[PDB]
Structure 1
Amino acid sequence: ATKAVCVLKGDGPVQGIINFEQKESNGPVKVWGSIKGVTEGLHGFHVHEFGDNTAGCTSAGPHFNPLSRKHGGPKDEERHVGDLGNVTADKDGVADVSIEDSVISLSGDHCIIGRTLVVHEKADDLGKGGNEESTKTGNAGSRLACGVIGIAQ
């Protein structure tokens, strides 16, 4: 049983805590926690390639994409490893996260430990948008908050 964790912070009000749990190597990873201080509605939620916060969330680079695929949603075959969709916030600006994903991992070449989890400004269109950027970033816009994913107890 591998566990990981991520504290999300940015330059505004957005903060969060996200936990990861993987009972078996190459089993599914349970993702759970809470994010607050975001606008009501969908916010893109991705693992970005680099655990680099040198100059804030920008330093994290593009979506974690070891298999060189196009951008998609977590339930698409054609997706980046880091493509975890959207979290959904209520009128109180709180998003309770409960995700299970079988593409990310906490070991091996799909390993997300030491990379950056990012919550975005706008919704991720899961690559179903009507432009070029949709199959690269999902049009989710700026990075509100982020954190490096670390090994947990």
Structure 2
Amino acid sequence: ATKAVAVLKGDGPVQGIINFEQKESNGPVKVWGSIKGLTEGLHGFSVSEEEDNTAGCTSAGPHFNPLSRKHGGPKDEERHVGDLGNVTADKDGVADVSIEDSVISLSGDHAIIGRTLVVSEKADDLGKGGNEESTKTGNAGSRLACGVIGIAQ
């Protein structure tokens, strides 16, 4: 199996450690971990295309979209590879991530390793909003924390 870790950091209090695992090179990817420092409620969770400046949040933003699709929720047929929906933070600001995804991969031509994991200020509207921007980013507001998806050491 192949594994990765992203350490999420930003300018504010949001931080977390997110794990990835994929048993077969074309198998589902499991994603898990906790993010703290969030406001209670839904927060957009995505893989950005950025693979150069993956440290800050400044250069991230455009979702990883190697197949030139429109933005959607993770279970939509039409979605970016980087569209991982929302995570939910509880009352004391902790969101637990538990995702199984069929579109991301840690191997091959479009591997998410090296790309930037991002947690955002607001809910991802899953591409169901009333403007073109919904179909690009889901209108999830500012990026609160991000980090490179690195191969596990």
**TM-score, normalised via structure 1 length:** 0.96
User: What runs of 5+ residues in structure 1 fail to find an aligned partner?
Assistant: none
Per-residue CA deviation, residues 86-145 of structure 1 (Å, 9 max, x unaligned), is 010011110000000010000112310000000000000000112221100000010000
Check whether the contact 1:14–1:145 (CA below 8 A) recurs between aligned residues. yes
Corresponding residue for residue 133 of structure 1: 133
Write the distance in 2 (CA, Å) between the matches of 1:25 and 1:55: 27
Check whether the contact 2:54–2:146 (CA below 8 A) recurs between aligned residues. no
Is the partner of 1:60 in helix, strand or coil? Answer: coil
Q: Return the offset for 1:26.
A: 0.8
Write the distance in 2 (CA, Å) between the matches of 1:29 and 1:149: 13
Per-residue CA deviation, residues 31-65 of structure 1 (Å, 9 max, x unaligned), is 00000001000000000001333772121241000
Consecutive aligned runs of 4 or more in structure 1 exceeding 4 Å deviation = none
Is the partner of 1:132 in helix, strand or coil? Answer: coil
User: What runs of 5+ residues in structure 2 fail to find an aligned partner?
Assistant: none
**TM-score, normalised via structure 2 length:** 0.96
**Does the C-alpha gap of structure 1 residues 61 and 134 become closer, same or farther in structure 2, counting only changes over 3 Å?**
closer
Check whether the contact 1:52–1:148 (CA below 8 A) recurs between aligned residues. no
